[PDB]
Amino acid sequence: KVFGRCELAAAMKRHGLDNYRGYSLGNWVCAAKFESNFNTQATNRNTDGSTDYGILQINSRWWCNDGRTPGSRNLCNIPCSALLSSDITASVNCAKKIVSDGNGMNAWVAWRNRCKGTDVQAWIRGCRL
Ligand SMILES: [Br-]
Ligand SMILES: [Br-]
Ligand SMILES: [Cl-]
Ligand SMILES: [Cl-]
Ligand SMILES: [Cl-]
Ligand SMILES: [Cl-]
Ligand SMILES: [Cl-]
Ligand SMILES: [Cl-]
Ligand SMILES: [Cl-]
Ligand SMILES: [Cl-]
Ligand SMILES: [Cl-]
Ligand code: NA
Protein backbone atom coordinates (compact mmCIF):
# COMPACT_ATOMS: atom_id res chain seq x y z
CA LYS A 1 0.00 0.00 0.00
CA VAL A 2 1.19 3.55 -0.71
CA PHE A 3 -0.08 5.78 2.18
CA GLY A 4 -0.88 9.33 1.85
CA ARG A 5 0.99 11.59 4.23
CA CYS A 6 -1.91 12.45 6.48
CA GLU A 7 -3.34 8.91 6.22
CA LEU A 8 -0.05 7.50 7.53
CA ALA A 9 0.12 10.15 10.21
CA ALA A 10 -3.37 9.01 11.43
CA ALA A 11 -2.37 5.36 11.25
CA MET A 12 0.84 5.91 13.18
CA LYS A 13 -1.07 7.88 15.85
CA ARG A 14 -3.67 5.14 16.21
CA HIS A 15 -0.87 2.58 16.63
CA GLY A 16 0.75 4.67 19.41
CA LEU A 17 3.78 6.27 17.75
CA ASP A 18 2.82 9.88 18.54
CA ASN A 19 5.45 10.91 21.11
CA TYR A 20 6.68 7.34 21.46
CA ARG A 21 10.13 7.50 23.22
CA GLY A 22 9.60 11.24 23.04
CA TYR A 23 9.53 11.45 19.21
CA SER A 24 6.66 13.48 17.92
CA LEU A 25 4.47 12.14 15.11
CA GLY A 26 6.17 14.37 12.51
CA ASN A 27 9.53 12.65 13.15
CA TRP A 28 7.92 9.28 12.39
CA VAL A 29 6.13 10.53 9.24
CA CYS A 30 9.35 12.20 8.08
CA ALA A 31 11.35 8.99 8.63
CA ALA A 32 8.75 7.03 6.67
CA LYS A 33 8.79 9.60 3.83
CA PHE A 34 12.52 9.24 3.26
CA GLU A 35 12.87 5.56 4.09
CA SER A 36 10.03 4.34 1.79
CA ASN A 37 8.11 7.27 0.24
CA PHE A 38 5.22 5.85 2.32
CA ASN A 39 5.18 2.49 0.43
CA THR A 40 4.71 -0.52 2.69
CA GLN A 41 6.10 -2.85 0.02
CA ALA A 42 9.48 -1.06 -0.27
CA THR A 43 12.51 -3.46 0.01
CA ASN A 44 16.19 -2.55 -0.50
CA ARG A 45 19.22 -4.87 -0.31
CA ASN A 46 22.22 -3.74 1.76
CA THR A 47 25.87 -4.31 0.95
CA ASP A 48 26.26 -6.79 3.82
CA GLY A 49 23.49 -8.98 2.28
CA SER A 50 20.72 -7.99 4.75
CA THR A 51 17.51 -6.32 3.40
CA ASP A 52 15.45 -3.44 4.64
CA TYR A 53 11.67 -3.85 4.59
CA GLY A 54 8.58 -1.72 4.78
CA ILE A 55 7.58 1.86 5.49
CA LEU A 56 10.44 2.25 8.01
CA GLN A 57 12.98 0.08 6.11
CA ILE A 58 13.59 -2.30 9.10
CA ASN A 59 16.69 -4.40 8.67
CA SER A 60 16.87 -8.19 8.54
CA ARG A 61 20.35 -8.14 10.26
CA TRP A 62 18.75 -7.49 13.67
CA TRP A 63 15.06 -7.29 13.54
CA CYS A 64 13.22 -9.79 11.35
CA ASN A 65 13.73 -13.09 9.66
CA ASP A 66 13.94 -13.30 5.84
CA GLY A 67 15.75 -16.65 5.61
CA ARG A 68 18.71 -15.19 3.72
CA THR A 69 20.69 -12.99 6.12
CA PRO A 70 23.38 -15.24 7.68
CA GLY A 71 24.12 -14.77 11.33
CA SER A 72 21.30 -12.29 11.80
CA ARG A 73 18.82 -12.11 14.61
CA ASN A 74 15.08 -11.63 14.52
CA LEU A 75 14.48 -9.44 17.59
CA CYS A 76 10.99 -8.46 16.57
CA ASN A 77 10.13 -12.19 16.21
CA ILE A 78 8.47 -11.75 12.79
CA PRO A 79 9.08 -12.76 9.23
CA CYS A 80 10.26 -9.67 7.32
CA SER A 81 7.29 -10.03 4.98
CA ALA A 82 5.07 -8.94 7.91
CA LEU A 83 6.67 -5.56 7.49
CA LEU A 84 5.23 -5.21 3.91
CA SER A 85 1.49 -5.49 4.78
CA SER A 86 -1.15 -2.78 4.20
CA ASP A 87 -1.67 -3.11 7.97
CA ILE A 88 1.22 -1.23 9.66
CA THR A 89 0.89 -2.94 13.05
CA ALA A 90 4.00 -5.18 12.67
CA SER A 91 6.15 -2.27 11.33
CA VAL A 92 5.01 -0.07 14.25
CA ASN A 93 5.55 -2.62 16.91
CA CYS A 94 8.97 -3.53 15.63
CA ALA A 95 9.91 0.19 15.23
CA LYS A 96 8.97 0.72 18.91
CA LYS A 97 11.60 -1.92 19.89
CA ILE A 98 14.21 -0.35 17.56
CA VAL A 99 13.73 3.20 18.91
CA SER A 100 13.96 1.80 22.48
CA ASP A 101 17.32 0.14 21.98
CA GLY A 102 19.59 3.08 22.97
CA ASN A 103 20.11 5.28 19.90
CA GLY A 104 16.58 6.64 19.56
CA MET A 105 15.67 7.47 15.96
CA ASN A 106 19.33 7.55 14.93
CA ALA A 107 18.72 3.87 14.05
CA TRP A 108 17.22 5.21 10.88
CA VAL A 109 20.08 6.78 8.96
CA ALA A 110 17.62 8.70 6.74
CA TRP A 111 15.98 10.16 9.83
CA ARG A 112 19.36 11.36 11.16
CA ASN A 113 20.36 12.80 7.81
CA ARG A 114 17.08 14.32 6.55
CA CYS A 115 14.68 14.82 9.48
CA LYS A 116 16.66 15.32 12.75
CA GLY A 117 16.60 18.94 13.78
CA THR A 118 14.32 20.08 10.93
CA ASP A 119 10.75 21.32 11.17
CA VAL A 120 9.26 17.87 11.41
CA GLN A 121 5.84 19.27 12.38
CA ALA A 122 5.42 20.25 8.71
CA TRP A 123 4.79 16.52 7.98
CA ILE A 124 1.59 16.41 10.01
CA ARG A 125 0.41 20.01 9.22
CA GLY A 126 -3.07 20.17 7.78
CA CYS A 127 -3.95 16.62 8.88
CA ARG A 128 -7.03 15.62 10.87
CA LEU A 129 -5.46 14.01 14.07
BR1 LIG B 1 -1.16 -1.22 18.83
BR1 LIG C 1 -6.03 -1.46 17.55
CL1 LIG D 1 4.56 13.91 1.03
CL1 LIG E 1 5.51 16.80 14.97
CL1 LIG F 1 21.64 -1.81 13.38
CL1 LIG G 1 17.40 -14.45 -2.69
CL1 LIG H 1 -2.71 -0.18 9.91
CL1 LIG I 1 -6.86 -2.97 5.86
CL1 LIG J 1 16.17 9.56 22.29
CL1 LIG K 1 -3.88 24.06 7.24
CL1 LIG L 1 -4.39 16.38 5.47
NA1 NA M 1 17.21 -11.74 10.59
CATH of the domain at 40: 1.10.530.10
CA atoms of 110 and 58, how far apart (whole Å): 12
CA atoms of 117 and 101, how far apart (whole Å): 21
Is 101 marked as a binding-site residue? yes
Q: Name the 3-class secondary structure at 43.
A: strand
**Resolution in angstroms, to 1 decimal, for this deposition?**
1.5
Give the Cβ contact number of residue 15 at 10 Å. Answer: 18
Distance 47 CA to ligand 8 centre (A): 33
Q: List CB contacts of 66: < 8 A, sequence separation 6 or more.
A: 51, 53, 60, 79, 80, 81
The sheet with strand 51-53 has its strands ordered as: 43-45, 51-53, 58-59
Report the number of distinct structural domains present in the chain. 1
Structure-derived torsion over alpha carbons of residues 109, 129, 97, 122, reported in degrees to the nearest 10: 10
Question: Does residue 35 have an active-site annotation?
Answer: yes
CA atoms of 99 and 53, how far apart (whole Å): 16
Distance 27 CA to ligand 4 centre (A): 6
CA atoms of 2 and 13, how far apart (whole Å): 17
CA atoms of 19 and 65, how far apart (whole Å): 28
Ligand at shortest distance from the CA of 15: 1
Q: Which domain holds residue 111?
A: 1-129
Distance 65 CA to ligand 3 centre (A): 30
Question: Does residue 7 have an active-site annotation?
Answer: no
